[PDB]
Design a protein around this nucleic acid. Structure first.
Lengths: 133, 188, 137, 170
RNA sequence: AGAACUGGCGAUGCGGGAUGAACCGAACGUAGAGUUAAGGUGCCGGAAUACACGCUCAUCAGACACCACAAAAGGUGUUAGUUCAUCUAGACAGCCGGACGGUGGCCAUGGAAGUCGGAAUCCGCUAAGGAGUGUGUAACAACUCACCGGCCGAAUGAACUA
RNA sequence: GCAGUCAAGCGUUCAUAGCGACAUUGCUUUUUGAUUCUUCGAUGUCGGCUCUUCCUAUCAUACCGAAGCAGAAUUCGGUAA
């Protein structure tokens, strides 16, 4: 319902101070047992998904209002169905991980691979963009 | 509630041209021409620019507005019937008696002849309409293909051809002899 | 020859600034402009220069004329009288062949019997030129 | 008939030990002066204890419209007695003056719901000041900008029983 | 079948209800003129094919008191309504991408794993996914929705009243 | 007498394929009553024979739909005199 949208609006906000890195992932064709082992292999990470126009507004789609600073740039970088991830151990590890990460999927025998596009650091307050396939 | 005006939009691609005097519709294009008589539906057609044509009903009731959408759907089948063209493929399920289906001609009348249906000596004749070409499936077993420009010429001739083979005084769960429409597709 | 030959079927349509002619009632043949539409059947009309008072009327009692001009919706009478003169619709009314026909049957009502006799003598002299101009081609 | 909105003021009775009864006024839509005095004691009996013999009418005043030529959107609340038990109704009318909208409401209830004059109680008629809160739809479709619509298929009222033109429409 | 009060008919014509002892109007000398009652004004049939706002389309319409028949119950036919909810931080419909793990919980056993049968009934991960709606395989496999997202661009859904 | 609607038990499972108890609303005058209206200075007051026409609430024939309808044989229903 709508109260799920007002819920997920909040835990996007309060995730910003607890974890220093903000990672957003483009993932179109995934499986739920594929997702749950992305979850359970990252116990330090807190992974919360949701609808885009909620996740845009929870990051703030305008440049005027925001929870922490330099926050609006990273929200515009995402186009498709996204799921956020919050870890703090290393910047080198996670971008190594989902390049190394691969499974198989449907043709619709064909490989499956989730990929990242935008990175952020809270205490540094700077927005990074990359393209790894 | 007496809607003040409603309207729809008819998309016209590049290859085809339409010509509309009062409610007579002529659609000309690559595969051929089709016509339709719409004197009864009480609408107003209007060109804006060479690809889009707005239909319109001013001050109409709900029975009048509901028939404004079906003017869209009847002219749009005239458009796809001339660019793409309509093509049905029917298959005929037989249990013990194979069915011999051919096309015979009696004074140019193009009759489809269903023989030996369920072991009957009766010879049935279903006339081919104007603007529908029936051919039999090369190198695929048990298939009859109806193709033409108009939907109402093709689909009625597909519906005529199944009801001539209807089973009487028998149970239908055991007896499945008959001709059926596999699917309704396009030419190109 | 690769165009859509769809006919126009042009119509007079009620709108703000559509000038009308009132056929029956107290007005009886005076111009007026539609100020504001109310619903399917009732409109709010006024003509200041003609002299019809501002009032709300049904569209049974009026007939639409093909002349128009621009007028903002909800305009008052003093606003209309300036737009009325600036478009010069009163001059543009008399240019039509339909305003001539009204004055034509009007003038035939007010003929003196001696004036009606002069129409006879002149229509005799007119046809004698016509019958010679005809039957030479 | 053509209704006229009136203001009727009532004062029970100046009696001994109670001078100055309080006062009461109402706004009454009626055809003439004689009905609206009698229609005043209809409602005002239901609200507290007076009668026509126990009461008297102070003054009646005809309320003309504050702005006739301005076109208004009107919301009306209606309590009418159907064949079953009575119930509320809210309708919206786009018309010219206050007393002309009640004219087109009694036609509207009689046509659609078959309610006579004696069943309907006009609760309150109020002017909707700003638009875009017009709740109903049939009032709302006339509020779009630059509204234009034709009148197709017009008839012509012929005075003679015969006409030689083979007449055509618009 | 038998009483109460009042008006009638019998004892009474005249206009109206096509027709009718009792209903509506009105009670009578003989004539002219004017105006009305009840009832009427497409035509028979004297009189507006008047004006105005709407509703209704019946493969048995409906048409004016007494009066010459109709009920309970039904109908996404149609026009109005009331009460609740959902939405422009994107609804309902349509397609398109997910739909999971503990755990085949157990009782049935010739064979059901959410599902031919049956007492029962939770957590984990979770945007979300029901010890689960059905198509059905002896049983598996396999599919869908309801639970969610992306394209998609304005209102919609449910229960009731007349 | 006949028809609606509510559905108890049944049709091994499962209210509504098929049967059907009673609540509740009706129609009919081919029933018995109720009335005693018109006929008591006659309306010739049972059944059968002969003969025409009409109603449909359809037993058969025609064409269809349903099932606990393999065929065959039936059962239930629709337009139909």
């Amino acid at each position: 319902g709508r109260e799920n949208k007002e819920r997920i609006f909040d835990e996007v906000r309060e995730a910003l101070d607890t974890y220093r890195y903000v990672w957003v992932l483009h993932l179109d064709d995934v499986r739920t047992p594929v997702l749950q082992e992305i979850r359970t292999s990252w116990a330090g990470s807190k992974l919360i998904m949701g609808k885009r126009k909620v996740l845009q507004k929870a990051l703030g789609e305008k440049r005027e209002e925001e929870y922490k600073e330099n926050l609006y740039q990273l929200s515009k970088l995402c186009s498709g169905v996204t799921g956020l991830l919050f870890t703090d151990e290393d910047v080198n590890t996670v971008k190594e991980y989902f390049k190394s990460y691969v499974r198989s999927d449907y043709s619709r025998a064909s490989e499956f691979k989730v990929k990242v596009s935008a990175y952020y650091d809270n205490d540094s307050s700077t927005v990074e963009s990359t393209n790894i396939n | 509630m007496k809607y003040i005006q409603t309207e729809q939009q008819i998309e016209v691609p590049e290859g085809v041209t339409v010509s509309i005097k009062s409610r007579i519709v002529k659609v000309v294009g690559p595969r051929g021409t089709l016509t339709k008589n719409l004197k009864h539906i009480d609408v107003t057609f209007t060109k804006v620019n060479n690809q889009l044509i707005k239909v319109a009903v001013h001050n109409g009731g709900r029975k009048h507005v509901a028939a404004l959408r079906t003017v869209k759907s009847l002219v749009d089948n005239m458009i796809t019937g001339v660019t793409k063209g309509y093509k049905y493929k029917m298959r005929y399920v037989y249990a013990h008696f194979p069915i011999n289906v051919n096309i015979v001609e009696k004074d140019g009348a193009k009759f489809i002849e269903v023989r030996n249906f369920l072991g009957d000596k009766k010879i049935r004749n279903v006339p081919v309409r104007d603007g529908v070409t029936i051919e039999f499936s090369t190198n695929v077993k048990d298939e009859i293909v109806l193709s033409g420009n108009s939907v109402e010429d093709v689909s009625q001739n597909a519906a005529d051809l199944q009801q001539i083979c209807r089973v009487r005084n028998k149970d239908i769960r055991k007896f499945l002899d008959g001709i059926y429409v596999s699917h309704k597709g396009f030419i190109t | 020859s690769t165009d859509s030959i769809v006919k126009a079927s042009n119509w007079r349509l009620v709108e703000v600034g559509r000038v009308v002619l009132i056929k029956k009632g107290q007005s009886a043949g005076k111009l007026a402009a539609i100020v504001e539409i109310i619903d399917q059947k009732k409109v709010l009309i006024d003509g200041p220069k003609a002299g019809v008072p501002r009032q709300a009327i049904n569209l049974g009692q009026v007939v639409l004329t093909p002349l128009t001009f621009a007028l903002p919706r909800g305009a008052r009478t003093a606003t209309v009288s300036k737009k009325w003169a600036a478009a010069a619709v009163c001059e543009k009314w008399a240019a039509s062949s339909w305003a001539k026909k009204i004055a034509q049957r009007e003038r035939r009502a007010a003929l003196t019997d001696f004036e009606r006799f002069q129409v006879m003598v002149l229509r005799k002299q007119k046809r004698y030129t016509v019958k010679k101009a005809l039957a030479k081609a | 008939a053509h209704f006229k909105e009136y203001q009727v003021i009532g004062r029970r009775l100046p009696t001994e030990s109670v001078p100055e009864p309080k006062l009461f006024r109402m706004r009454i839509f009626a055809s003439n002066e004689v009905i609206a005095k009698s229609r005043y004691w209809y409602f005002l009996q239901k609200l507290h204890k007076v009668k026509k013999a126990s009461g008297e009418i102070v003054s009646i005043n005809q309320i003309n419209e504050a702005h006739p030529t301005k076109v208004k959107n009107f919301g009306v609340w209606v309590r009418y007695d159907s064949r079953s038990g009575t119930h509320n109704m809210y309708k919206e009318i786009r018309d010219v003056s206050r007393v002309a909208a009640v004219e087109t409401l009694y036609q509207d209830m009689a046509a659609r719901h078959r309610a006579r004059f004696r069943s309907i109680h006009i609760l309150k008629v109020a002017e909707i000041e700003k638009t875009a809160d017009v709740k109903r739809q049939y009032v709302k479709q006339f509020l779009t900008k630059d509204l234009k619509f034709p009148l197709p298929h017009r008839v012509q009222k012929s005075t003679k029983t015969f006409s030689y033109k083979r007449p055509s429409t618009f």
